[PDB]
Amino acid sequence: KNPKSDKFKVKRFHHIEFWCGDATNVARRFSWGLGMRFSAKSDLSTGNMVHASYLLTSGDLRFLFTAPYSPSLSAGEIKPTTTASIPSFDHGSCRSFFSSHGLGVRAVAIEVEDAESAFSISVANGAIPSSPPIVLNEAVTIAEVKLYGDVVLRYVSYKAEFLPGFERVEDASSFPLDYGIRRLDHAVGNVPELGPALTYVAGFTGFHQFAEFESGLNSAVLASNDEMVLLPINEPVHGTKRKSQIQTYLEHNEGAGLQHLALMSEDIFRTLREMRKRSSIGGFDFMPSPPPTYYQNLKKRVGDVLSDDQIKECEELGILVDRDDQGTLLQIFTKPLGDRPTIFIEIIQRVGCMMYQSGGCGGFGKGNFSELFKSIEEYEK
Amino acid sequence: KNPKSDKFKVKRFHHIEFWCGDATNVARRFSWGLGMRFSAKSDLSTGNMVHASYLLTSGDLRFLFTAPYSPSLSAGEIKPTTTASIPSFDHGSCRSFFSSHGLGVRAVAIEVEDAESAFSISVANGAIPSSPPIVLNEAVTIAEVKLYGDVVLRYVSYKAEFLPGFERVEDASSFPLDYGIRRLDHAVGNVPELGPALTYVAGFTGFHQFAEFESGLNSAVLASNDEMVLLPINEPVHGTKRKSQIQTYLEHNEGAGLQHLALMSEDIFRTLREMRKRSSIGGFDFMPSPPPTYYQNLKKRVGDVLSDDQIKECEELGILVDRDDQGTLLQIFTKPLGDRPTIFIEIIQRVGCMMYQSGGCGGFGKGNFSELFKSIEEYEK
Ligand SMILES: Cc1c(C(=O)C2=C(O)CCCC2=O)ccc2c1c(=O)n(-c1ccccc1)c(=O)n2C
Ligand SMILES: Cc1c(C(=O)C2=C(O)CCCC2=O)ccc2c1c(=O)n(-c1ccccc1)c(=O)n2C
Ligand SMILES: [Co+2]
Ligand SMILES: [Co+2]
Secondary structure, eight states: OOOOOOOOOOOOOEEEEOOSSSSSHHHHHHHHHHHHHHEEEEEETTTTEEEEEEEEHHHHHHHHEEEEEEEGGGOOGGGGGOOSSSTTTTHHHHHHHHHHHSSSSEEEEEEOOHHHHHHHHHHHHTEEEEEEEEETTTTEEEEEEEETTTTEEEEEOOOOSSSTTOOOOOOOGOOOSSSSSSEEEEEEOOOHHHHHHHHHHHHHHHOOOOOOOSSSSEEEEEETTTSSSSSEEEEEEOSSSOOHHHHHHHHTTTTTTTEEEEEESOOOOHHHHHHHHTGGSSSBBBBBOOHHHHHHHHHHHHHHTOOHHHHHHHHHTTTTTEEEESSSEEEBBOOSSSSSSSOEEEEEEEEBBBBBBBTTTOOOSTTTHHHHHHHHHHHOO | OOOOOOOOEEEEEEEEEEEOOOHHHHHHHHHHTTOOOOEEEEGGGGSSSEEEEEEEEEEEEEEEEEEOGGGGGTTOOOOOOOOOOOOTTHHHHHHHHHHHSSSSEEEEEEEESSSHHHHHHHHHHOOOEEEEEEEETTTEEEEEEEEEHHHHEEEEHHHHHHHTTTTOGGGEEEEEEEESSEEEEEEEEEEEEEEHHHHHHHHOOOEEEEEOOEEEEEEEEEEEESSSSSEEEEOOOOSSSSHHHHHHHHHHHHSSSSEEEEEESSSSHHHHHHHHHHHHGGGGBBBOOOOOHHHHHHHHHHHTTSSSSHHHHHHHOOOOOOOOSEEEEEEEEEEEESSSSSSEEEEEEEEBBBBOBBBTTSSSSSSHHHHHHHHHHHHHH
């Protein structure tokens, strides 16, 4: 059931901003490993004396990487005279975020009809303000509220290319990489307590709980009206045999934050072939693959959706498969993106729920906790 | 003239340590862009709760990338009980270094006969101590003194694989990249005042001035007995037409530090082909190439050392060429390695001075300041 209780008009995920120590090196690594092109920049060469920000794109997916310069370069500036292209940026906040959490997501940005309105309504409904609405070149409005931990939910709205003050990157510096990733499907937070986290965010957005079907977690999913913005949230379950990966996150991340970004591919097989070719030459590594019993067990579960060849292709690439009552999910998880066992990426593709495909078709793979366990025991034979 | 006045026995450059915000992402980028394999690690998976350190190698060149974890992971430790593999590491120092300078070199490490002796003698001769000699697993001794700014000169000596507590990386995670780079030729510091910098370092090492032949700089080179350890130092020259690149460095770096690392290739043509193929897919960009007049002018200067084809190959790759009285130098410079216009890399190959090749054969390319200027004017025709 979907009560369509959004308190302001939400369109789509717009972008994800990483706060880095060196934006250049993270962005170049992510570009190669994920097949995203360099699309826009705001840095010293564009007149920004405050921060370096580089934008990667693949389809509609937008990854922004930002790091502070020396405060000495902009010491004479004040907010009215700032050269920063993202007015919510603050040197002290960025250094404190990164020193506290390491590399990770600072902003989950969604496009809305009116960012000023979304901010006002959100704050009126319990949101903790983080950066007030600011109109950029009379063209774009951006505002931020706290989501969980030091992660903010960023609203962006356009009167009518990324943001004013960003320049389109030189054609020669912009190699057209593409491994098939097309948009952000969902963005997941880890928190110590799921209940209060859910009440707060659903409180100020109006997002409704998205319907699901000892793994170390309890989780729930918040969703916008058309269920295209999906924000799952996890809490640990303690006292378990194997230590909870949610708890390990909170420990190494110094508290709550974004756990994983799930990127939808138009062809998960090609995406995984391309990413795995690059794992040991600068790209991303993947979780260890399930045993062959897991793939033997796929004939019975989804043998009506995937052929034997497509199931064998899943096995070659370590892909996981789960199923709802409305659709099927193909998924795989990377190892952590940086030094700490905190943030990782999920690659996904959804089959079914055609009307356009409805959001969350096939779920989020919680069925794969059971099947991975049974599979491991099966293989132990 | 070489008075061979070293105050302790120095062997070779051993390694360069970068202090990073996220060592994983910098190391993966450098590996792909320079063609260096992952050779050793010390991180959570090896029991190091203090820092993540990853070692890349190409031939004898050793790049170490280190970043701190949350201090909370090791809050119960004391130096006697440390899990750090590099006992000189300090969370506060590393965060302060990186927040002050951004990505750059923390340690220039040289192998010596006896690191304890080199430390004692250095300090007795004016060196500012930074980390006292510490014996690792009764096998390796490491000690550090200040070089310039927040850069240290690290001494390492072995009784008899990188350092104790480092593990050799998994074969599958260690792809055998190699674009022909083989060793560190020289490591260059930028300082506000060359005179005091030279007197200090030559004071405590015994290194002698290495013989040279409005570019924005004055420079001098310090060298060990066999002139295989080469430490050039630059200071700005002010009041010039075009602003001094040494001054821009000092401003953006918040003071003195390492300007460039020069990496010797066994085949600079292949190295530059391989690096340029990767510039826009995660690797490194190069300075804009000299005009064709520069290469037309190469026939007269070095036409007895390089064929017409080799000169044309230099022109295809943007390589610079300079000449001593004893040898010839092929060189090219990358754009800055990270966000700030501070540290960059030089690729070089030296021709001549065969006895083994003697160090610094052909110089450091200061002749290319003149030739680049004349070339630009020539081309302006
Ligand atoms: C993160 C994840 C998801 C996932 O995306 C996700 C959502 O989108 C929102 C709902 C909660 C949730 O979990 C699905 C299945 C996973 C995992 C996962 O992390 N692990 C795992 C655990 C410990 C070590 C290695 C892997 C799994 O085993 N399964 C089977
Ligand atoms: C750094 C460099 C070197 C070099 O390696 C080096 C040493 O090893 C030690 C002695 C001093 C020194 O300079 C040689 C020649 C260079 C440059 C250089 O930086 N530039 C440059 C300047 C401004 C913008 C872009 C490039 C040059 O034009 N030349 C021609
Ligand atoms: Co997910
Ligand atoms: Co040089």
